Design a protein around this ligand. Structure first.
Ligand code: CLA
Ligand code: CLA
Ligand code: CLA
Ligand code: CLA
Ligand code: CLA
Ligand code: CLA
Ligand code: CLA
Ligand SMILES: CC1=C(/C=C/C(C)=C/C=C/C(C)=C/C=C/C=C(C)/C=C/C=C(C)/C=C/C2=C(C)CCCC2(C)C)C(C)(C)CCC1
Ligand SMILES: CC1=C(/C=C/C(C)=C/C=C\C(C)=C\C=C\C=C(C)/C=C/C=C(C)/C=C/C2=C(C)CCCC2(C)C)C(C)(C)CCC1
Ligand SMILES: CCCCCCCCCCCCO[C@H]1O[C@H](CO)[C@@H](O[C@H]2O[C@H](CO)[C@@H](O)[C@H](O)[C@H]2O)[C@H](O)[C@H]1O
Ligand SMILES: CCCCCCCCCCCCO[C@H]1O[C@H](CO)[C@@H](O[C@H]2O[C@H](CO)[C@@H](O)[C@H](O)[C@H]2O)[C@H](O)[C@H]1O
Ligand SMILES: CC1=C(C/C=C(\C)CCC[C@H](C)CCC[C@@H](C)CCCC(C)C)C(=O)c2ccccc2C1=O
Lengths: 176, 85, 730, 42, 156
């Protein structure tokens, strides 16, 4: 008779999903263009030339500052104005609810027709690949496990074992 | 990591090698790549010589095919007059 | 109710405040109800007036359990495979001291885990797989890891058959309330087709793969894994391809054979299980029956038939109902299931059925006391649920005027006797011991009761035991010794470290324990019998069945009017049985070690874990803490810093939990109220309490938290006391 | 999807995913510092 | 909608007579190759003596299953797709003449049955076209283990 999901954070779940998948975009094209390595060949020296390295972790803090600000500020406003208290529109806070967030303050607003919209015209471009990208990524990320695991050599770890016949990798192809 | 010359001087190589006589497998069953065996024309126990034997014969084995069902023999029990012994 | 009825909400109700009895949970808040509802989550007064489903629910709950065992024991069988102990032990058995289970080392933990093994640190085990196990011949760790997932297969599926009932649109009356077959099937082909099927995989495969294990090897130096079909050369040893018989029958000749079988009697030497070869025959000779037997039949027919003058009219239509009581057809069952478990507990210790038991002491007495508390924990139940019948289950009266209506006719009568029975016992069944103290402490042995002093004189010997082994005068043929090795006649010879099994001859000081059991078994039952009988109406209350089998107590009047009921007869009847079993255990190990459990030594001079201290010294009931509790238990209170240690380290808690029960058992109720407010006050000053009216325990809940604790207290106390005096010497 | 002035619910014993876990991460501090009985500071 | 499998009293054997057609032409390759068989090393060994005079030269690769799952797809598609209402065959994205159907929704010798006119000759109920091919199915069933071995045909 069937569960009811519908779940209601939800519409958010789908926009969370865009983040994951559009981001998932960076990976594929670039690594793979991969230089079709490559003509040949790739050297880093340059910065990191001998400066005791470059990033390690410190690289991760900068990565995050730059981001924190962005991921953070953010959803903080994809949207959301009204912003208080007592009783429900349900979004889940819903505060923006009736008031958009502002009657009369500014142009919070973008564009014609007392609205947020860029407007009617297009699902087009980007519902099919961008969501098709919801799909794409998952299988191609599912492809990443396939691509390393089995670690040819270095590490069995803890064997009840019982492979080899032969190694695993990516270069590409498949044998067979 | 860090790099000194050239990812390799001479790239990637023998890790799949096989190339000419990219063999193993087809062949091996090189006896097989071909089967050519026995005789042409007939009488009897090919089965070589190598390979071997006539063992049980005409229908048996061969099977394999043998070939061609003769006017036989005709395996069915009964004959063989069961020659043990 | 109406969130929203019928036809028009798929939409589930989670929310708006929820349910039971019609001035349903109030709206307005309380605590008790959170305790209600785990309790009496099923009673079946409520959910529906009309049995309708419930039989349609109890099939599903059953499925859940079968799965669960399965989830269990995949677990077990895992554990058993891949933390092995087992591969190592089996080449090695009678050296090994076996674990399935290991901690990880975090904080203290790991004192615990102390070398068991074929060279690994362990927690030593006393349930034996590793002995259920011997049977598998084929071996190796990753399979049991198949038998394991084979377990998780049966589960998910034998757990989606429970979706595939109640929740799925699901079944109706006839199907149970036409019985007519049900035992037909059950006993015929499962009871049968298992034991049967078990035969087929109990000589095929197991017999041979321990026929030439009972020598050594490194397994698979013996057994290929599939090996065992069209083939078989191997049967040839262990016998013929029947060579020329036909489908048994006779025009058959043996000059030398008779098919595998060939009955054993006595124990294997160098694996003293008992022969692995009467094990096929016996299971085969079972199934047949069941195979023939489950072929009755369709019912009242037989029950409606024979009547007598005392005897009961009622016997007839002794229950249209029976098909639909349930609570009754569970109560009957528990008495049997239950009373048919602790009959295991004997045939086990005086006739092992697995390779390496007895020598393995601790890994089959754990058993004989676990199996022992079920053949008791399930019996008092087998009364409770009859009380649950005797009060409620049928809408209306129409059982009428029988056999029951008979038994009740007398009732201040069947229980009028039974009473005196007990005070006759007790006086002949305990103060008997107290004589000894009062007179051996006075000290004049001339006149005690000692096995030496008051005269029977030095034989036990002839009653049954001596006729039982001695067995073949008989229409009996068979097998060099006994059905059970212990019986008096026969043998020195059993086993390789150690003694496994020997006469046990008793005398007196087996005489009178055997009698305390009587009196203990009897006054237990008095309270349950009179409890379930006086279920519904009594000379003290007539208006007595009216809410309850539970109600707390009717009210301060009539003098007392408190305990009454029959939840409570099944509350004070547990209280006894905890002894019934708790002292039967105390009996067996003090025997089985004072005599029997052994060692062999050159020229076989037996060295009992205690040179029979029992002799003159159980008879004194202080000797029962001189020789028991203070003697053994010295291993519990020495057990610190070790490996088992978790016992000594339990033995304080749970020897605490018990001594917490009395608080729940011995106390008022508007007391912890009167207190709970002083609390509730201090609470309000800071503004921190009211919502969900905090309330004291529900008169009878308080009794529920007696008892239950008094048992998991007073019990694991010995579960510790035990595993701590068989692991290590003994 | 949750903004300002209390949110969505949860079951009877999510305390059994709060005794188990959270608290559980704490053995996780009782092996990182496999020991105590006083403690250095940061 | 969260899922449907209508069953009435005999759902089964509507299939069954179905599991049976497929199953039945699989009695089949029996009707008209025959041994995987087993657990595949030979590499040395047959059941227990099998063989002799390991099976086979044996190409085959288990990739099936990867095949069983994959064709599974077709099976369950023909069945939804026709739920139906049909766009389905797109034809030529542009233009003009598209005579060709090829006929039918098939069943049988003319997509429309066709070539109606025929025989002078060859001259002289459809669970029966089922019933007898289990009476071809369960037959090799015992013929796998079809042996008495120690002895043989008592009959004879
Ligand atoms: C390694 C394995 C070998 C084995 C053991 C199998 C086994 C199987 N294959 Mg299969 N297959 C193989 C190699 C193998 N295949 C290869 C190399 C290919 C590539 C061509 C295929 C392509 C293939 C397809 C497309 C299908 C199968 C299917 C099947 C299953 C069908 C059962 C059946 O009896 O249908 C046949 C028995 C019948 C009674 C049907 C009769 C229909 C006939 C008349 C049509 C074909 C005969 C035709 C007139 C010959 C003309 C030549 C033409 C092939 C060019 C069966 C389990 C089928 C399946 O199970 O899908 C769910 C189907 O999917 N296989
Ligand atoms: C084959 C039978 C079996 C079945 C199917 C039932 C079924 C039933 N019994 Mg029942 N019963 C049985 C055997 C069975 N009983 C036995 C053997 C006894 C004797 C002890 C009883 C004594 C009994 C009583 C007194 C009552 C029932 C009642 C009931 C009904 C209420 C069920 C309920 O709410 O769960 C109740 C379970 C709980 C609330 C769970 C609490 C369990 C606690 C005590 C834990 C046990 C200790 C354990 C060591 C703790 C776990 C470890 C921990 C330390 C970590 C139900 C129809 C009740 C009724 O009113 O009838 C309608 C009534 O209360 N039974
Ligand atoms: C019968 C009971 C049941 C019980 C009481 C246990 C108890 C235990 N299992 Mg276990 N297990 C079970 C069923 C059970 N298992 C089943 C059905 C499976 C198959 C899925 C497993 C597969 C399993 C594994 C793989 C492990 C355990 C481990 C453990 C121990 C780790 C404690 C833990 O789970 O939380 C924390 C503990 C002694 C762990 C262990 O043995 O290491 C000490 C190991 O992690 N179990
Ligand atoms: C229900 C039981 C169980 C099962 C599933 C089997 C199954 C089998 N037994 Mg068997 N067997 C069993 C109990 C079982 N046995 C018991 C209890 C005994 C001794 C009392 C035997 C003594 C026995 C012998 C001597 C042989 C078998 C053989 C066989 C195989 C083929 C012949 C047959 O019995 O049935 C199928 C029926 C026909 C083929 C007709 C088959 C695998 C034979 C074998 O190896 O394969 C042919 C033969 O060796 N069994
Ligand atoms: C109340 C009823 C009615 C009466 C008056 C009796 C009376 C008797 N029954 Mg009885 N019986 C009855 C109904 C009755 N039965 C019914 C309905 C059944 C079936 C349930 C039986 C099944 C039955 C059995 C199996 C036996 C009796 C026996 C006896 C006798 C006891 C032996 C004795 O005193 O001599 C002994 C005196 C000496 C001096 C020696 C006694 C005459 C016993 C008997 O046959 O006599 C020994 C035997 O044990 N009855
Ligand atoms: C889960 C695993 C465990 C494992 C590892 C195996 C492994 C195997 N089983 Mg198997 N089997 C198991 C449990 C297992 N079985 C159980 C529990 C049963 C009954 C419960 C069987 C009943 C079984 C049968 C009837 C057969 C096998 C056969 C096989 C073999 C085919 C292998 C091959 O050569 O292909 C490359 C393979 C060795 C086949 C075999 O041994 O003959 C070739 C045979 O058909 N098994
Ligand atoms: C929620 C889902 C369910 C529903 C309601 C639909 C609905 C639809 N799918 Mg679809 N689909 C589904 C699940 C579903 N799908 C799944 C699980 C898959 C596997 C990934 C697909 C893969 C899929 C593909 C590849 C296509 C569709 C297409 C379509 C659309 C028409 C089909 C078509 O153009 O091909 C028939 C081909 C034609 C040339 C038809 C032309 C006009 C007529 C024939 C239409 C009838 C239609 C809106 C088609 C589309 O245009 O989507 C972008 C496209 O073909 N689906
Ligand atoms: C139709 C058919 C058939 C059928 C098959 C089947 C399906 C079968 C079966 C078989 C079976 C069906 C078997 C069964 C068995 C069972 C058993 C063997 C039982 C068991 C159990 C157990 C083991 C338990 C135990 C215990 C106890 C003691 C109590 C509680 C606890 C525990 C659980 C531990 C045949 C063959 C003819 C073939 C043809 C077709
Ligand atoms: C401070 C604190 C605390 C406290 C703690 C303590 C102090 C404790 C204790 C405890 C004690 C002091 C005792 C207890 C005990 C318990 C028990 C004990 C449980 C259980 C059980 C079981 C599991 C069992 C089982 C069994 C069986 C199977 C049947 C019979 C036998 C036996 C019993 C073995 C905590 C941390 C908590 C919280 C926070 C605060
Ligand atoms: C079909 C082709 C796609 C549409 C784009 C082509 C241009 C046609 C106008 C739409 C462009 C959107 O931007 C524009 O929309 C209106 C069209 O009603 C413009 O023009 C109008 O704006 C108001 C509605 O928005 C009207 O009440 C005003 O009378 C008029 O000035 C706006 O000044 C501008 O915001
Ligand atoms: C414990 C109090 C004693 C009261 C019961 C005594 C009556 C029976 C005599 C002793 C009982 C023990 O039985 C035991 O006898 C002998 C010890 O002397 C041993 O005798 C065993 O050792 C030797 C080795 O070949 C031989 O003498 C025997 O052939 C053999 O049976 C056995 O291990 C056991 O069969
Ligand atoms: C001590 C005693 C009490 C008092 C016992 C009480 C009040 C026990 C109930 C205490 C509960 C279990 C505490 C529950 C509070 C926590 C579960 C809430 C916080 C949740 C956690 C995360 C800690 C009775 O109510 C009683 C009633 C009848 C006969 C005898 C007695 C009796 O002896």
């Amino acid at each position: 008779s069937d569960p009811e999901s519908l779940r209601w954070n939800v519409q958010a779940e789908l926009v969370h999903s865009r983040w994951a998948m559009l981001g998932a975009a960076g990976i594929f094209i670039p690594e793979f263009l991969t230089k079709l390595g490559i003509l040949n060949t790739p050297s880093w020296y340059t910065a990191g030339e001998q400066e005791y390295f470059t990033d390690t972790t410190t690289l991760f803090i900068v990565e995050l500052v730059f981001i924190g600000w962005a991921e953070g500020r953010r959803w903080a406003d994809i949207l959301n104005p009204g912003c208080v208290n007592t009783d429900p529109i349900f979004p889940n806070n819903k505060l923006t609810g009736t008031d958009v967030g502002y009657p009369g303050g500014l142009w919070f607003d973008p564009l014609g027709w007392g609205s947020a919209s860029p407007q009617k015209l297009k699902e087009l471009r980007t519902k099919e690949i961008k969501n098709g990208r919801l799909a794409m990524l998952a299988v191609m990320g599912a492809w990443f496990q396939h691509i390393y695991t089995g670690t040819g050599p270095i590490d069995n770890l803890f064997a009840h074992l019982a492979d080899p016949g032969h190694a695993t990798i990516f270069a590409a192809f498949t044998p067979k | 990591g860090v790099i000194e010359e050239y990812l390799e001087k001479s790239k990637t190589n023998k890790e799949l090698n096989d190339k000419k006589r990219l063999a193993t497998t087809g062949a091996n069953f090189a006896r097989a790549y071909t089967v050519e065996f026995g005789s042409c024309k007939f009488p009897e126990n090919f089965t070589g010589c190598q390979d071997l034997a006539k063992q049980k014969k005409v229908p048996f084995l061969s099977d394999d095919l043998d070939l061609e069902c003769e006017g036989k023999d005709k395996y069915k029990c009964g004959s063989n007059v069961f020659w043990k012994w | 109710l109406v969130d929203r009825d019928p036809i028009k909400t798929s939409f589930e109700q989670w929310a708006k405040p929820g349910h039971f009895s019609r001035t349903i949970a109030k709206g307005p808040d309380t605590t008790t109800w959170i305790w209600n509802l785990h309790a009496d989550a099923h009673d079946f007064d409520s959910h529906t007036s009309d049995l309708e489903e419930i039989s349609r629910k109890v099939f599903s709950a059953h499925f859940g359990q079968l799965s669960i065992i399965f989830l269990w024991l995949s677990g077990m069988y895992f554990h058993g495979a891949r933390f092995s102990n087992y591969e190592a032990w089996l080449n090695d058995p009678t050296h090994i001291g076996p674990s399935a289970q290991v901690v990880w080392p975090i904080v203290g933990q790991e004192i615990l885990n102390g070398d068991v093994g074929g060279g690994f640190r362990g927690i030593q085990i006393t349930s034996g797989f590793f002995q259920i196990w011997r049977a598998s011949g084929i071996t190796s760790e990753l399979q049991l890891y198949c038998t394991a997932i084979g377990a998780l297969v049966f589960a998910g599926l034998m757990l989606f058959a429970g979706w595939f009932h109640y929740h799925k649109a699901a079944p109706k009356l006839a199907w149970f309330q036409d019985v007519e077959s049900m035992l037909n099937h059950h006993l015929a082909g499962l009871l049968g087709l298992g034991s049967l099927s078990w035969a087929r995989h109990q000589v095929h495969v197991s017999l041979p793969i321990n026929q030439f294990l009972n020598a050594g090897v490194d397994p698979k130096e013996i057994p290929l894994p599939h090996e065992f079909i069209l083939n078989r050369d191997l049967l040839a040893q262990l016998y013929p391809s029947f060579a020329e018989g036909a489908t048994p029958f006779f025009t058959l000749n043996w000059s030398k054979y008779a098919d595998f079988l060939t009955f054993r009697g006595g124990l294997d030497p160098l694996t003293g299980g008992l022969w692995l070869t009467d094990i096929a025959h016996h299971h085969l000779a079972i199934a047949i029956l069941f195979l023939i037997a489950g072929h009755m039949y369709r019912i009242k027919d037989i029950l409606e038939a024979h009547k007598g003058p005392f005897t009961g009219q009622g016997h007839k239509g002794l229950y249209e109902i029976l098909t639909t009581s349930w609570h009754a057809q569970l109560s009957i069952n528990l008495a049997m299931l239950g009373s048919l478990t602790i009959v295991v507990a004997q045939h086990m210790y005086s006739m092992p059925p697995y390779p390496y038991l007895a020598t393995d002491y601790a890994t089959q007495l754990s058993l004989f006391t676990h199996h022992m508390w079920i053949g008791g924990f399930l019996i008092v139940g087998a009364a409770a649920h009859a009380a649950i019948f005797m009060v409620r289950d049928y809408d209306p009266t129409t059982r009428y005027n029988d056999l029951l209506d008979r038994v009740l006719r007398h009732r201040d009568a069947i229980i009028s006797h039974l009473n005196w029975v007990c005070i006759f016992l007790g006086f002949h069944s305990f103060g008997l011991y107290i004589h000894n103290d009062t007179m051996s402490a006075l000290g004049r042995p001339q006149d005690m009761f000692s096995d030496t002093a008051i005269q029977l004189q030095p034989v036990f010997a002839q009653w049954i035991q001596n006729t039982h082994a001695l067995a073949p005068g008989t229409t009996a043929p068979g097998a060099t010794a006994s059905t059970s090795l212990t019986w008096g006649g026969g043998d020195l010879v059993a086993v390789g470290n150690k003694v496994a099994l020997l006469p046990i001859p008793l005398g007196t000081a087996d005489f009178l324990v055997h009698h305390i059991h009587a009196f203990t078994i009897h006054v237990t039952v008095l309270i349950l019998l009179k409890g379930v009988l006086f279920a519904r109406s009594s000379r003290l209350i007539p208006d007595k069945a009216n809410l309850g089998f539970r109600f707390p107590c009717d009210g301060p009047g009539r003098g007392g009017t408190c305990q009454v009921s029959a939840w409570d007869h099944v509350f004070l009847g547990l209280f006894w049985m905890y002894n019934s079993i708790s002292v039967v255990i105390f009996h067996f190990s003090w025997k089985m070690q004072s005599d029997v459990w052994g060692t062999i030594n050159d020229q076989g001079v037996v060295t009992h874990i205690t040179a029979g201290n029992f002799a003159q010294s159980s008879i004194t009931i202080n000797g029962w803490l001189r020789d028991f509790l203070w003697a053994q238990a010295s291993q519990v209170i020495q057990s610190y810093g070790s490996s088992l240690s978790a016992y000594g380290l339990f033995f304080l808690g749970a020897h605490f939990v018990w001594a917490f029960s009395l608080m729940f058992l011995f106390s008022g109720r508007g007391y912890w109220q009167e207190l709970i407010e002083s609390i509730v006050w201090a609470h309000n000053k800071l503004k921190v309490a009211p919502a969900t009216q905090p309330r004291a325990l529900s008169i009878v809940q308080g009794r529920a938290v007696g008892v239950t604790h008094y048992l998991l207290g007073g019990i694991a106390t010995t579960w510790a006391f035990f595993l701590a005096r068989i692991i290590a010497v003994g | 999807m949750r903004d300002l002035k209390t949110y969505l619910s949860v079951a009877p014993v999510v305390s059994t995913l709060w005794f188990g876990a959270l608290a559980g991460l704490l053995i996780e501090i009782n092996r990182f510092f496999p020991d105590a009985l006083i403690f250095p500071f940061f | 909608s969260d899922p449907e499998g209508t069953g009435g009293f005999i759902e089964p054997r509507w299939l069954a007579y179905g599991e049976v057609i497929n199953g039945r032409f699989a009695m089949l390759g029996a009707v008209g190759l025959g041994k995987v068989g087993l657990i595949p090393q030979e590499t040395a060994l047959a059941w227990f003596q099998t063989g002799v005079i390991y099976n086979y030269w044996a190409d085959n690769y288990t990739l099936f299953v990867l095949e069983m799952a994959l064709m599974g797809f077709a099976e369950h598609r023909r069945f939804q797709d026709w739920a139906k209402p049909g766009s389905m065959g797109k034809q030529y994205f542009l233009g003009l003449e598209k005579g060709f159907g090829g006929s039918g929704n098939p069943a049988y010798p003319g997509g429309p049955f066709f070539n109606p006119l025929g025989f002078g000759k060859d001259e002289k109920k459809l669970k029966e076209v089922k019933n007898g091919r289990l009476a071809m199915l369960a037959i090799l069933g015992y013929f796998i283990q079809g042996l008495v071995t120690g002895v043989g045909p008592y009959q004879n």
